[PDB]
Amino acid sequence: XXXXXXXXXXXXXXXXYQVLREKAASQRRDVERALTRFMAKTGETQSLFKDD
Amino acid sequence: KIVAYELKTGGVLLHPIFGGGKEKDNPASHLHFSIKHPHTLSWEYYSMFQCKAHLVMRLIENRISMEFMLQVFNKLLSLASTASSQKFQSHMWSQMLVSTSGFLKSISNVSGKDIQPLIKQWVDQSGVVKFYGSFAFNRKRNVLELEIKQDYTSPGTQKYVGPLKVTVQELDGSFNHTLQIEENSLKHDIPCHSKSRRNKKKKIPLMNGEEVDMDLSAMDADSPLLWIRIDPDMSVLRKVEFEQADFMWQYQLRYERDVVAQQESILALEKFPTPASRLALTDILEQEQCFYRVRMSACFCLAKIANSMVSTWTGPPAMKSLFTRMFCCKSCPNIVKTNNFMSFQSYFLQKTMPVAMALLRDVHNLCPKEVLTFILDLIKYNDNRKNKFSDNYYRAEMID
Secondary structure, rough: OOOOOOOOOOOOOOOHHHHHHHHHHHHHHHHHHHHHHHHHOOOOOOOOOOOO | OOOHHHHHHHOOOOOOOOOOOOOOOOOOOOOOEEEEEOOOOOOOHHHHHHHHHHHHHHHHHHHHHHHHHHHHHHHHHHHHHHOOOOOOOOOOOOHHHHHHHHHHHHHHOOOOOOOHHHHHHHHHHOOOEEEEEEOOOOOOOOOOOOOOEEOOOOOOOOOOOOOOOEEEEEOOOOOEEEEEOOOOOOEOOOOOOOOOOOOOOOOOOHHHOOOOOOOOHHHHHOOOOOEOOOOOOOOOOOEOOOOOOOHHHHHHOOOOOOOHHHHHHHHHHHHHOHHHHHHHHHHEEEEEEOHHHHHHHHHHHHHHHOOOOOOOOOOOOOOHHHHHOOOOOOOOOOOOOOOEEEEOOHHEEEEEHHHHHHOOOOOOOOOOOHHHHHHHHHOOOOOOOOOOOOHHHHHHHOOO
8 A cells, every 4th residue: 555545644633622722821921921021111110129 | 887887986876956055965976076067077977877877767667667668758759749849839838848857747647656766766876786695595405495695785885775576596497586675684585496306207397488408417416496686687786796506507507598697607607616517518508599798708718717727627728629610611621711701600709719719828838829829820811702791800809
């Protein structure tokens, strides 16, 4: 069958529900912290300690 | 509110009596003038003015039927609408001044009872009444039969209220109601239950309708009594202090038809105890259809009692299994995440419970580390617009 016949390729399955929504919530947390740092260092700033 | 403020400060009195002739006549002048003038009072005093107005109208419920009150109010608005919208009848127009005297006369014309003693008690003697109704136990195979003593003295801000009634629920039986007297160093009876013996056979002889409950777990050797109560319809401005067996308090929290009884047993079992059966019965009470805020204060019971589990850590780290066993999104593989709304039981409960989880502390460094990481993971797992309910207060109480 290595020479005559053939097959078909998909090459992408994970199917892990809890892992998928962990990845989605981690990406949401990353977007939160990224925009947090962005407009944290962008605009008018008052800190918690001195010069955070 | 009323007990808290009138134990902070003096009473909120409803004067018919003036201080005319440059007189004071004010025991309620612990701070300020109250008789003839609005703009001296405080908003604590003004709020408790409205609150005592609520509960004096509930005393008028407790002595006079609601239908008679509808008759009174229809008479008041009939005189008001007849006296209004006319050509200004001269000297015959002030019938819209329907103040306390003529209103009292209208009530007495509808139904004349002892409402002037109700005035001289609650309208004209601004006092919060505690209740040291000391439980005694007769018919513990005793000579005397089901007797309870009445006692009260607590000065500074006290008041002696006499003839009332007392509500006792039996094991499986009648609502026993018992009179009260003045001169409050008293002993009183109960209109006794039968001797409920062979209670393995007497499973449910009609507790309250068709309610289904079976426990010999109490001190049920010689105990036909379950619960003490003074005016469950909340007539008297009260702060009742007494003691029962702890099994009676915990059996009140499996089921009782009063949210008042549930949250007062919640407070009384927030004070002293720590068995694990208390935690079990609390978790049983939290998983039914009973009430919203009872379970809020029951999670606060779990908080206060698990704070007393420092050397007595018998159960698990609490309230994780309560989020596990009650919430299945897609059977929830160890984590509850998404779309738990449209049932406001679960909305208020998920709003409340992690606040009580953060109180769960045992004294090494108070170490809520599993709870901290679990709250961090809950803050991770918020929802999109599948919830159409603007997920704001859930975030706010998790930040709390």
